[PDB]
Amino acid sequence: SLWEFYMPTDVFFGEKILEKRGNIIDLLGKRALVVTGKSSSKKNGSLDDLKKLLDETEISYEIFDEVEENPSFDNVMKAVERYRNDSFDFVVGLGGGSPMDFAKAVAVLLKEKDLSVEDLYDREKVKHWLPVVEIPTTAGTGSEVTPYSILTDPEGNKRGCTLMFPVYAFLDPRYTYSMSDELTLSTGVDALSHAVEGYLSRKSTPPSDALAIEAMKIIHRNLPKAIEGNREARKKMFVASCLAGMVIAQTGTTLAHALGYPLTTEKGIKHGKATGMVLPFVMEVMKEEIPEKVDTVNHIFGGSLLKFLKELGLYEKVAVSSEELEKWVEKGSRAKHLKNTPGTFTPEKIRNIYREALGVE
Amino acid sequence: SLWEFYMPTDVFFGEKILEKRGNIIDLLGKRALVVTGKSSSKKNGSLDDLKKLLDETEISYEIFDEVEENPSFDNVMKAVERYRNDSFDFVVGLGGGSPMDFAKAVAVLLKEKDLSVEDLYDREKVKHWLPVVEIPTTAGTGSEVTPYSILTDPEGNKRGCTLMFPVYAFLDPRYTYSMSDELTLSTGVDALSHAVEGYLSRKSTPPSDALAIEAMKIIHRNLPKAIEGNREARKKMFVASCLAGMVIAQTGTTLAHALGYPLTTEKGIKHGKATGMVLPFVMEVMKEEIPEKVDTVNHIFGGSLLKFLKELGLYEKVAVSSEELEKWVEKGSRAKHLKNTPGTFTPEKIRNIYREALGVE
Ligand SMILES: NC(=O)c1ccc[n+]([C@@H]2O[C@H](COP(=O)([O-])OP(=O)(O)OC[C@H]3O[C@@H](n4cnc5c(N)ncnc54)[C@H](OP(=O)(O)O)[C@@H]3O)[C@@H](O)[C@H]2O)c1
Ligand SMILES: NC(=O)c1ccc[n+]([C@@H]2O[C@H](COP(=O)([O-])OP(=O)(O)OC[C@H]3O[C@@H](n4cnc5c(N)ncnc54)[C@H](OP(=O)(O)O)[C@@H]3O)[C@@H](O)[C@H]2O)c1
Ligand SMILES: [Zn+2]
Ligand SMILES: [Zn+2]
């Protein structure tokens, strides 16, 4: 066999974590660029805490609070072209996966001033970048512990790239208490999918399996209560989302993530819910290769992950034309994730996965 | 509550791993110092593989193959003084815990020529150091993924310190197939203790708990067969020892490790066996603060860790005087590990832990 474990991010978790461990960012420089969403970070106390930390460490900064959900190439360039004229020592991503991923792309482009966003997809061109600090507020994408960035290209397709691991990750569960029940559900299922896909992936490793198993157990026991607003459960979900991120940082994701993309970009379905909807059906095909592991996942979730997700009210009614379905099937058949997904996926199997997922509601 | 996860070592695992991924050390420099034991690494093909790797990568080197079991301050200075006139870019530890720990100490001292071994216990003085590469051959201390180094001081006492994390760890399971049944047993129990102590420690964290649980399950299922010589079992033990190293790299150890030291330094009992002998009894006390987790550990090991260890033939007959016992009880009452160990340990309880462990056989 042959495997590798690499997750160099220094992770700090706890209430008031920026106050208690945040000063370490002073090792990164004297001026920082903060990238965050339009309003969430202003309402959960995170931006205020960050401003306090920057003031305390006497680090000057600028705030780009215009990151959109599922950020596009243009969104990133709208910030890069402007901040390339400044001189930042490091970048801080604050919020959900969108601003956290946005921060990684900007960190490279502010250093590599001659590169375009498309160039980021060429690993050979990514050799220099500003350090990145991530402060997540959802539970979650686990972006604070992965080297990935996902952007929507000019054609409207979600495309991911591998950049750098954040130097520091600061997780304060209090920031997640403001999530709506619906966002808690979607982000929680995204975390669930990361742990499940990482465990079932052909790139699975012993360390990532260990982390994935614990994450799955935590999510199974806490997601329902978290959605309802139970604080202790939300704290556990935040822990699980981080563990799951560590997992995919080793394994990457599977066809489940790839197939959910069009549901998000074309049907407005939140990322986590989109992935979660197709995941159980992708698993049915994976069974042809790893039935034991698939059985393990179903057992952890009470006997059936599909039923577990259905009980959460995850499935949505989605309008899909034959024309749209065929387009999604064609794109899925070319997903890079296919190589790391157990099972044999023909266009018909992918077509069936969508029909099954869409057929629930 | 508040926790941190940090384990930056880039870990590579697999048969012929040095041949397949070792070239990456080219990024560390052009000259290196190899520290290892007298014969071991020369008989399992590891030193041969390392020599070949260094030749292929065109990296000059010198070999210090005089690291003794449980190295002392003088041992380290012997190598340091012998090579302080030279100029190395990085250090490579090859072998078990002794040479790997030796490597970390030397890596600092060769950089900071004005420091003594005693200075290494002062975190403030350890500012710079040469990069370290670890290649373990036992399953194991997990030293390849921890920042710890343990040496025997002039007084003959085991004293550990925290230095740096190795940049790269290369694990080839084939190297462990040459271990004697006794060494497999002792190093295997050491790994078991790391996982168990890390899980039970007051410094336990979610990520380390995840890794510890998996490590414990692997060891329970494979240690007996590994001792018998089963290669699949030994390969699994090697994975577990690594996972366990990642665990203590976050948690540190408990009173069990502390109480076993005098058995090693004064009675020649191998580290793993010494810790393992007292572990079940230290756990009995822990049950006062964390009965849930202790029950979990016993459940994983077939219902009783004590019985599991006894069945391995772990316990040894040891000649101990009252004077010696009282000295150990006294020192045990002043171990830093006490603070991170659940339960209340009175001199009477510690004396009883030793009596119980020594009374088994
Ligand atoms: N790096 C990776 O490996 C990885 C993994 C999984 C997913 N992703 C990517 O991450 C993105 C998904 O991010 P996400 O699900 O965390 O959400 P998101 O897209 O970052 O934002 C979701 C929405 O929730 C809001 N929000 C964020 N934190 C909140 C809080 N604490 N309380 C209330 N509302 C809050 C946001 O408000 P504001 O806009 O006002 O801030 C936003 O409107 C996708 O683009 C996905 O492809 C990346
Ligand atoms: N850094 C940490 O966090 C950490 C954790 C646990 C323990 N430790 C420390 O590590 C030391 C324990 O090391 P250890 O149990 O791995 O053993 P060790 O002390 O490194 O050596 C044990 C003996 O086994 C031999 N050996 C090593 N690899 C072998 C192989 N593949 N086949 C056959 N024989 C082999 C050695 O031979 P040669 O002498 O010929 O090489 C040596 O004589 C202690 O000093 C302990 O305090 C450190
Ligand atoms: Zn995701
Ligand atoms: Zn040990």
Interface test with A, best of B6, B194, B293, B300 (most A CBs within 10 A): B6
* Inter-chain CB proximity B13 and A1 less than 8 Å: yes
* Inter-chain CB proximity A4 and B20 less than 8 Å: no
Neighbour-count burial of B230, counting CB atoms closer than 10 A to its CB (0-12 exposed, 13-18 middle, 19+ buried): middle
CA terminus-to-terminus distance, chain B: 41
Would an 8 Å CB–CB cutoff place B359 in contact with chain A? no
The partner residues of A83 in beta bridges, in order of sequence, read none
* CA–centroid distance, residue B312 to ligand 2 (Å): 20
Q: How far is A171 from A239, CA to CA, in rounded Å?
A: 9
Q: How far is B121 from B318, CA to CA, in rounded Å?
A: 31
Helix extents (H) in A228-333: 231-251, 255-267, 271-286, 291-300, 305-311, 322-332
Pairing of strands A31-37, A10-13: unpaired
Of B251, B249, B226, B221, the C-alpha closest to B238 is B226
CA terminus-to-terminus distance, chain A: 43
* Inter-chain CB proximity A12 and B4 less than 8 Å: yes
* Inter-chain CB proximity B213 and A210 less than 8 Å: yes
Q: How far is A44 from A46, CA to CA, in rounded Å?
A: 6
Interface test with B, best of A214, A236, A250 (most B CBs within 10 A): A214
Q: How far is B317 from B263, CA to CA, in rounded Å?
A: 11
Q: Please calculate the CA angle B250-B252-B253 and round it to the nearest 5 degrees.
A: 140
Q: Is the CB of A166 under 6 A from ligand 1?
A: no
Pairing of strands B148-152, B158-162: antiparallel
Q: How far is B293 from B341, CA to CA, in rounded Å?
A: 13
DSSP summary character for residue A68:
P
- Name the residue type at position B232: E
Of A308, A239, A189, A324, the C-alpha closest to A14 is A239
Q: How far is B191 from B239, CA to CA, in rounded Å?
A: 10
Would an 8 Å CB–CB cutoff place A7 in contact with chain B? yes
Q: How far is B123 from A132, CA to CA, in rounded Å?
A: 27
**CA B52 to each of CA B22, B23, B48, B136, B266: distance values in angstroms, whole numbers, following the listed order:** 10, 11, 6, 17, 39
* Inter-chain CB proximity A206 and B7 less than 8 Å: no
Pairing of strands B168-171, A60-67: unpaired
The partner residues of A160 in beta bridges, in order of sequence, read A150
* CA–centroid distance, residue B96 to ligand 2 (Å): 3
Q: How far is A16 from B35, CA to CA, in rounded Å?
A: 44
The DSSP secondary structure of B241-308, one letter per residue, reads: HHHHHHHHHHH---HHHHHHHHHHHHH---HHHHHHHHHHHHHHHHTTT-HHHHHHHHHHTTT-HHHH
* CA–centroid distance, residue B135 to ligand 4 (Å): 17
Helix (H) or strand (E) holding A37: strand A31-37
Ligand positioned closest to the Cα atom of A190: 3
**B131: helix, coil or strand?**
coil
The partner residues of A91 in beta bridges, in order of sequence, read A33, A132
Would an 8 Å CB–CB cutoff place B2 in contact with chain A? yes
**CA B196 to each of CA A21, A247, B81: distance values in angstroms, whole numbers, following the listed order:** 28, 22, 39
Q: Which residues surround ligand 3, an ion (CB under 5 A)?
A: A 190
Find all residues with CB under 8 Å of B10, minimum gap 6, and list them: A4, A5, A6, A8, B24, B167, B168, B169
The partner residues of B31 in beta bridges, in order of sequence, read B60
Q: In chain B, what residues touch A239 (CB-CB under 8 Å)?
A: 206
C-beta separation of A259 from A350 below 8 A: yes
Find all residues with CB under 8 Å of A62, minimum gap 6, and list them: A33, A34, A83, A86, A88
C-beta separation of A247 from A215 below 8 A: yes
C-beta separation of B131 from B90 below 8 A: yes
Hey, what's the torsion of the CAs at A142, A148, A149, A155, to 10 degrees?
Answer: -120
Q: Which tokens sit at B319?
A: 């000649």
Q: In chain B, what residues touch A206 (CB-CB under 8 Å)?
A: 13, 214, 218, 239, 242-243
Would an 8 Å CB–CB cutoff place A209 in contact with chain B? yes
Q: How far is B350 from B329, CA to CA, in rounded Å?
A: 6
Hey, what's the torsion of the CAs at B338, B344, B345, B348, to 10 degrees?
Answer: 170
Helix (H) or strand (E) holding B139: none
Q: Which tokens sit at A60?
A: 């000057």
Domains and CATH numbers, chain A: 8-180 (3.40.50.1970), 181-360 (1.20.1090.10)
**Ligand 2 pocket test: which of B43, B75, B108, B138 has the largest number of ligand atoms within 8 Å of its C-beta?**
B138
Neighbour-count burial of A104, counting CB atoms closer than 10 A to its CB (0-12 exposed, 13-18 middle, 19+ buried): buried
Q: In chain A, what residues touch B218 (CB-CB under 8 Å)?
A: 206
Q: How far is A314 from A180, CA to CA, in rounded Å?
A: 15
Half-sphere exposure of A220 (CA within 13 A, CB side): 21
Q: How far is A263 from A281, CA to CA, in rounded Å?
A: 15
Distance of CA A75 to the CA centre of its chain: 18
Starting from the edge strand earliest in sequence, which strands make up the sheet with A10-13, in order? A60-67, A31-37, A90-95, A132-136, A168-171, A10-13, B3-5
- Name the residue type at position A8: P
Rounded to 10°, the helix B206-228/B291-300 angle is 30
Q: In chain B, what residues touch A3 (CB-CB under 8 Å)?
A: 12-14
Can you give the resolution of this entry in Å? 1.6
Separation in Å, CA of A26 to nearest CA in chain B: 17
Helix (H) or strand (E) holding A135: strand A132-136
Cα radius of gyration rounded to whole Å, chain B? 20
* Inter-chain CB proximity A207 and B15 less than 8 Å: no
Pairing of strands A148-152, A158-162: antiparallel
Separation in Å, CA of A248 to nearest CA in chain B: 14
Of A28, A75, A80, the C-alpha closest to A54 is A28
Neighbour-count burial of B65, counting CB atoms closer than 10 A to its CB (0-12 exposed, 13-18 middle, 19+ buried): middle
Neighbour-count burial of A360, counting CB atoms closer than 10 A to its CB (0-12 exposed, 13-18 middle, 19+ buried): middle
Q: How far is B38 from B36, CA to CA, in rounded Å?
A: 7
**B67: helix, coil or strand?**
coil
In B, minimum Cα distance to A14 occurs at B2
In B, minimum Cα distance to A242 occurs at B207
Q: Is the CB of A247 under 6 A from ligand 1?
A: no
Q: Is the dihedral of CA B213, B214, B220, B226 positive or negative?
A: negative
Q: Which tokens sit at B162?
A: 């925290």
**A19: helix, coil or strand?**
helix
Q: How far is B214 from B222, CA to CA, in rounded Å?
A: 12
Q: Please calculate the CA angle B30-B36-B42 and round it to the nearest 5 degrees.
A: 100
DSSP summary character for residue B236:
H
Of A256, A216, A266, the C-alpha closest to A357 is A256
Q: Is the dihedral of CA A190, A192, A193, A198 positive or negative?
A: positive
The residues in A 283-302 lying below 8 A from B, measured between CB atoms, are: none
Q: Please calculate the CA angle A254-A219-A214 and round it to the nearest 5 degrees.
A: 80
Q: Which tokens sit at A90?
A: 């490091």
In B, minimum Cα distance to A165 occurs at B8
Phi-psi region of B88 (alpha: psi -120 to 50; beta: other; left: phi over 0): beta
Helix (H) or strand (E) holding B115: none
Cα radius of gyration rounded to whole Å, chain A? 19
Q: How far is A329 from A347, CA to CA, in rounded Å?
A: 6
C-beta separation of B196 from B305 below 8 A: yes
Of B52, B10, B12, B51, the C-alpha closest to B34 is B51
